[PDB]
Short mmCIF file of C-alpha atoms in Angstrom, two decimals:
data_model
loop_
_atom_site.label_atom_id
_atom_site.label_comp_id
_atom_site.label_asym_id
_atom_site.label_seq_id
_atom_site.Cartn_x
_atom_site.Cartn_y
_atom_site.Cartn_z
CA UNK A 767 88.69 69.94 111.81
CA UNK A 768 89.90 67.21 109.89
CA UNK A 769 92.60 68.91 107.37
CA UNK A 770 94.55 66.84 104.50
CA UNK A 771 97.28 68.20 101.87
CA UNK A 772 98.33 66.07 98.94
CA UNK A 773 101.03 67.07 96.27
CA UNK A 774 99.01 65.51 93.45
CA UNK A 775 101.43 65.56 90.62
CA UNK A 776 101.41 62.13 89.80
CA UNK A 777 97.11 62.02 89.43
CA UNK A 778 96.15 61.44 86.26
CA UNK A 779 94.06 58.76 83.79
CA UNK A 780 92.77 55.92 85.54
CA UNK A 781 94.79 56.58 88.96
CA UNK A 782 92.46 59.28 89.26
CA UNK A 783 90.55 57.03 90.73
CA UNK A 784 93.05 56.93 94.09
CA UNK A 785 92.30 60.52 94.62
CA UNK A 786 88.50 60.55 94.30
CA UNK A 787 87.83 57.25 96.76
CA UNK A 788 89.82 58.81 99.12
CA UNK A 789 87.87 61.81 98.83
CA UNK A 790 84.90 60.09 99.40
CA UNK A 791 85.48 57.33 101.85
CA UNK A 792 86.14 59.76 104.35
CA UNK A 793 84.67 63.15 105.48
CA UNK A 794 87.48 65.52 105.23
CA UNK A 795 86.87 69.12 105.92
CA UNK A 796 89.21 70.66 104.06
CA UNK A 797 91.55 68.72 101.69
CA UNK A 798 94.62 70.60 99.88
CA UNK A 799 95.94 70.33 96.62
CA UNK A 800 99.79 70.73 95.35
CA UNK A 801 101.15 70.29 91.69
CA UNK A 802 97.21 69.81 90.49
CA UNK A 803 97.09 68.81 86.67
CA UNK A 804 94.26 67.97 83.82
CA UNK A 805 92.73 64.83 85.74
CA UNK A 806 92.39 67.02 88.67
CA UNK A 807 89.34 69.26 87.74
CA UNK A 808 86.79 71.21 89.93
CA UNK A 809 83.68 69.93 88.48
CA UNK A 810 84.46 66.32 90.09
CA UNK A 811 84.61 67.86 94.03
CA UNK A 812 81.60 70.56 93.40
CA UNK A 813 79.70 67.33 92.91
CA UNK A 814 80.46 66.04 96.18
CA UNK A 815 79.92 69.37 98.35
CA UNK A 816 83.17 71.10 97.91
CA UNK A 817 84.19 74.80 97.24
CA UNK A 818 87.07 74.62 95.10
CA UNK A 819 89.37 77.23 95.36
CA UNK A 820 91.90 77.20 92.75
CA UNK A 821 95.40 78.95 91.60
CA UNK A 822 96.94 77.68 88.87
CA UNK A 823 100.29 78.83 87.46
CA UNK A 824 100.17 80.79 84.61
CA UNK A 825 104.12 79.75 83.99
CA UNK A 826 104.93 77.32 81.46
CA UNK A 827 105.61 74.33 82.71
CA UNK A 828 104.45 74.49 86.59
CA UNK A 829 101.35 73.57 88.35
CA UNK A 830 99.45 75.12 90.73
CA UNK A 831 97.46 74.50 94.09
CA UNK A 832 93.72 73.74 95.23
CA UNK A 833 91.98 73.92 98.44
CA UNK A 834 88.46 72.39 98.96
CA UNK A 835 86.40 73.45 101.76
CA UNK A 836 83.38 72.76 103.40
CA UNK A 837 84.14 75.68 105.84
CA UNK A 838 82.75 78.78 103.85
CA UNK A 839 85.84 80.73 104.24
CA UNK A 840 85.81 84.26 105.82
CA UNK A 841 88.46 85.79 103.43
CA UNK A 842 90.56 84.01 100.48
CA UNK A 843 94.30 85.13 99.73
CA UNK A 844 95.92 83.75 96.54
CA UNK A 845 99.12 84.41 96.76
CA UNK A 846 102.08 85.98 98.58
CA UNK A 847 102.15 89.25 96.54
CA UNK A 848 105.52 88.11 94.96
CA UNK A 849 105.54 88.63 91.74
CA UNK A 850 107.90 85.43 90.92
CA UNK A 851 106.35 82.94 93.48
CA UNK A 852 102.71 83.54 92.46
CA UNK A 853 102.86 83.18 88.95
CA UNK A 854 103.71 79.50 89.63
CA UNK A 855 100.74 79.35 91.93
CA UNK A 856 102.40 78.31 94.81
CA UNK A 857 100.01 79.59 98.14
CA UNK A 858 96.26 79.24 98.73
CA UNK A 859 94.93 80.60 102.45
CA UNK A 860 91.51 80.75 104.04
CA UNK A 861 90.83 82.82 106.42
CA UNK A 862 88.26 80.12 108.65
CA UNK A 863 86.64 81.68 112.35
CA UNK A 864 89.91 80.37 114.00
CA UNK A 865 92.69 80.55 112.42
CA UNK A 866 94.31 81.10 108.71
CA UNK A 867 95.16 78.08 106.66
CA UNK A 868 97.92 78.03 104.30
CA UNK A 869 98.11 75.73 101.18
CA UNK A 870 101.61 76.15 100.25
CA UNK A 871 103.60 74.49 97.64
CA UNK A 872 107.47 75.13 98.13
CA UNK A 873 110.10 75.05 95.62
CA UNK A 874 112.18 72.08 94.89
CA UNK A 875 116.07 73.55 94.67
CA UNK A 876 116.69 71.55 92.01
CA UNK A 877 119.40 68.17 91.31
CA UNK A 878 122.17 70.86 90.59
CA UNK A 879 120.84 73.36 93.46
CA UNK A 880 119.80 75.79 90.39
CA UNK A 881 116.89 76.80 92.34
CA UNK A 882 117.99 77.09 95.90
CA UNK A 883 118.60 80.81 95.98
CA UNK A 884 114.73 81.09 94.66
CA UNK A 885 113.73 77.94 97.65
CA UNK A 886 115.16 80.37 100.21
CA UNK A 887 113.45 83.46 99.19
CA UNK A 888 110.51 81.87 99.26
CA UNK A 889 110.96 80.47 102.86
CA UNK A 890 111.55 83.99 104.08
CA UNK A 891 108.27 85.76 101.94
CA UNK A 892 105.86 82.80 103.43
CA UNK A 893 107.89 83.18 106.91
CA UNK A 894 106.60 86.80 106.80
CA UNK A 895 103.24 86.45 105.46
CA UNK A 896 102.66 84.04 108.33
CA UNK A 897 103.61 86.59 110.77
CA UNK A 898 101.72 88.77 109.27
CA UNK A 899 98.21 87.20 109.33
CA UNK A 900 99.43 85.91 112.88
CA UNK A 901 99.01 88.88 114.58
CA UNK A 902 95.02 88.39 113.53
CA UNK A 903 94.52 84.85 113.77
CA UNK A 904 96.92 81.71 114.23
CA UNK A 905 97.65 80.11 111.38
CA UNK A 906 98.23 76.53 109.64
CA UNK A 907 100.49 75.92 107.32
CA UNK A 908 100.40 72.68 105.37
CA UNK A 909 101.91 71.51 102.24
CA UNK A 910 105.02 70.17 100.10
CA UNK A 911 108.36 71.96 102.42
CA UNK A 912 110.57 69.98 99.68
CA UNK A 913 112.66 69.98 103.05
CA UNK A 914 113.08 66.85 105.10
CA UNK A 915 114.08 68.87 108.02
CA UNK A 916 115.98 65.76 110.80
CA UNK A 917 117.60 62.98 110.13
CA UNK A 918 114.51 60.94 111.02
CA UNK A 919 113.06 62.94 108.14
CA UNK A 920 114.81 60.38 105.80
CA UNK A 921 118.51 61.49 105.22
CA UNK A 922 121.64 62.81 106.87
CA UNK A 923 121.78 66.59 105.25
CA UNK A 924 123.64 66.87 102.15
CA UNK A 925 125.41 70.65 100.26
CA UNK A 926 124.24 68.88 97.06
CA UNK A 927 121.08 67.04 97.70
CA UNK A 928 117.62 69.29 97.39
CA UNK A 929 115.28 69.18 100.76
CA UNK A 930 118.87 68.04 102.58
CA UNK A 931 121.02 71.18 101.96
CA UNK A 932 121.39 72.81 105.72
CA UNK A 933 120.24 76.51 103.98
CA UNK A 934 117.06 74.60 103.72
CA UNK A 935 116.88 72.24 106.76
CA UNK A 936 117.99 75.55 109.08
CA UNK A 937 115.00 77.67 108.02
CA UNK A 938 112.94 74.82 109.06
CA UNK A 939 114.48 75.08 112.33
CA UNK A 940 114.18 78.92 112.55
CA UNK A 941 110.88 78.55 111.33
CA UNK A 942 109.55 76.57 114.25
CA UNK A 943 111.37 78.73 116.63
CA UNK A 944 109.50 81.75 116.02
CA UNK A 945 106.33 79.85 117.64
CA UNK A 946 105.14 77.14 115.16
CA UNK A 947 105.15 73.40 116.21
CA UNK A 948 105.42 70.40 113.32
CA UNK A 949 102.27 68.64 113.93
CA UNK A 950 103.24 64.87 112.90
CA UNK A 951 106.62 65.01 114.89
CA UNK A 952 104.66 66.94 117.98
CA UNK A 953 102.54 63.79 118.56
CA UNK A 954 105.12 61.14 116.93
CA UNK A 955 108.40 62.48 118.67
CA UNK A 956 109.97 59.68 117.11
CA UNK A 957 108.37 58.00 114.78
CA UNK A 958 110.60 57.49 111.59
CA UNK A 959 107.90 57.86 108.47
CA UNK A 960 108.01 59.18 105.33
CA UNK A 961 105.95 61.08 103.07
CA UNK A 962 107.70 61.13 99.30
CA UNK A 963 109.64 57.96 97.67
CA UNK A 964 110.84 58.23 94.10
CA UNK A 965 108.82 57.03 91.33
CA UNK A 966 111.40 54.91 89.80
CA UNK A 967 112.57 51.49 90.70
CA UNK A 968 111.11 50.11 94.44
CA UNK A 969 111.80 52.84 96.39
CA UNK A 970 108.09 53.09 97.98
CA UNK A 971 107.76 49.51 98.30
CA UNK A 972 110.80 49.46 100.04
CA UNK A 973 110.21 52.50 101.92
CA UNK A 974 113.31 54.43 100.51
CA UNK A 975 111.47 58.06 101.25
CA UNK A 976 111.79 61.32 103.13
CA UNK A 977 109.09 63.37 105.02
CA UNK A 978 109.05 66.37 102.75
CA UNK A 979 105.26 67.39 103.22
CA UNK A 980 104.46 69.02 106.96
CA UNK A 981 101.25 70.78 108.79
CA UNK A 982 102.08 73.00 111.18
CA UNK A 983 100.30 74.97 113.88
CA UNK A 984 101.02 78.39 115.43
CA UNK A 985 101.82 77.84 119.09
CA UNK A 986 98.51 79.34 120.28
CA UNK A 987 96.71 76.21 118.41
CA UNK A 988 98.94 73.34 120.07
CA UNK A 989 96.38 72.04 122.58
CA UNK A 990 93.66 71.72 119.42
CA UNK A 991 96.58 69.10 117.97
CA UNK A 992 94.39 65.63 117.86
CA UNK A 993 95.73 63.14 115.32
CA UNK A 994 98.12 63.79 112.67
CA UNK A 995 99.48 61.02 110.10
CA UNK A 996 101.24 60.14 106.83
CA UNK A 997 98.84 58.41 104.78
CA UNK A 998 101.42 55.77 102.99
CA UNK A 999 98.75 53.14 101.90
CA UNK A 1000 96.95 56.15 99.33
CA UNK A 1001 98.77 55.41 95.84
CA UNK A 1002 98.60 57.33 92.80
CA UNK A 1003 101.74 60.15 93.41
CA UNK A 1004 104.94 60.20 94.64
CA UNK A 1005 103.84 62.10 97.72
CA UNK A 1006 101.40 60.31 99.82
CA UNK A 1007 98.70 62.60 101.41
CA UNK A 1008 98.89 64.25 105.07
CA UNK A 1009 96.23 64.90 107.88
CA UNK A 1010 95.83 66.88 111.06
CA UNK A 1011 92.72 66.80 112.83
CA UNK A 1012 91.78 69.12 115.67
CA UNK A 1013 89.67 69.54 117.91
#
């Protein structure tokens, strides 16, 4: 009912202690995890009540996702069954009573574009496993895009730029066009707000960002859509944390 995702990357040592008093000072049914590293650990979310369902990378260098849940889940998929994608632990989904939800960490193309071939074949294997488990249940998918897909998503698109290239920026279009509605920009038509700022320098204090993290809703779920936010004031990564609440 109340559904977060956070690309955690920069959590760790004493800013740790962003992540679990924001845990705590609210009552958030299920909260999801991107880029989760060594501060991150299960034990801490146990304690409070939490199933922790993790899947970590096994590649060198990456780092995986984590859902907590205090809906017992029906079903739990790790995984798109893509060799490539899943072995740098990229998708979580539950399967709750009413619908799927997806804990998706996307690909960054890379500053040279090195990974944008990889970005886009991984836009059109999640694309499908959507529409797969749609024909059961809707489905929610939250998590890092690493697109900002408008203008008022932070930037002007860009053929060099990763999250700005229009390869990138269309599939978010085609994406929503199959039946899928962005859940911040459904109740905020136009509301400029951001979700990333660089670490470096006073970009986030200056509110130099783009919207690069998304939840998003089958069509079939639309009139559940109750609140949905950026969370700017919650420090500790260069992502600030998301929620949708429903009904």
């Amino acid at each position: 009912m109340k559904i977060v995702s956070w690309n955690v990357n920069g959590i760790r040592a004493a800013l740790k202690k962003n992540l679990i008093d924001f845990i705590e000072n609210n009552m958030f049914e299920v909260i999801m995890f991107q880029e989760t590293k060594g501060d991150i650990v299960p034990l801490d979310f146990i304690m409070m009540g939490y199933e922790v369902i993790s899947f970590p990378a096994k590649r060198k260098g990456y780092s995986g996702v984590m859902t907590l849940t205090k809906i017992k889940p029906i079903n739990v998929i790790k995984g798109l069954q893509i060799k490539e994608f899943d072995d740098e632990g990229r998708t979580v989904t539950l399967e709750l009573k009413d619908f799927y939800v997806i804990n998706a960490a996307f690909p960054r193309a890379g500053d040279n574009l090195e990974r944008l071939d990889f970005k886009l074949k991984f836009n059109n294997e999640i694309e499908n496993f959507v529409l797969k488990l749609r024909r059961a249940k809707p489905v929610i998918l939250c998590g890092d895009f690493n697109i900002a897909h408008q203008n008022i998503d932070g930037a002007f698109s860009d053929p060099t730029i990763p999250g700005l290239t229009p390869q990138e920026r269309s599939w978010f279009s085609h994406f929503l066009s199959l039946g899928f509605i962005d859940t911040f920009r459904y109740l905020h038509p136009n509301v400029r707000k951001y979700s990333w700022w660089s670490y470096m320098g006073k970009a986030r204090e200056k509110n130099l960002g783009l919207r690069l993290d998304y939840c998003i809703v089958s069509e079939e779920l639309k009139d559940r859509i109750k609140m949905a936010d950026i969370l700017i004031d919650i420090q500790g990564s260069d992502h600030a944390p998301i929620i949708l609440e429903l009904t």
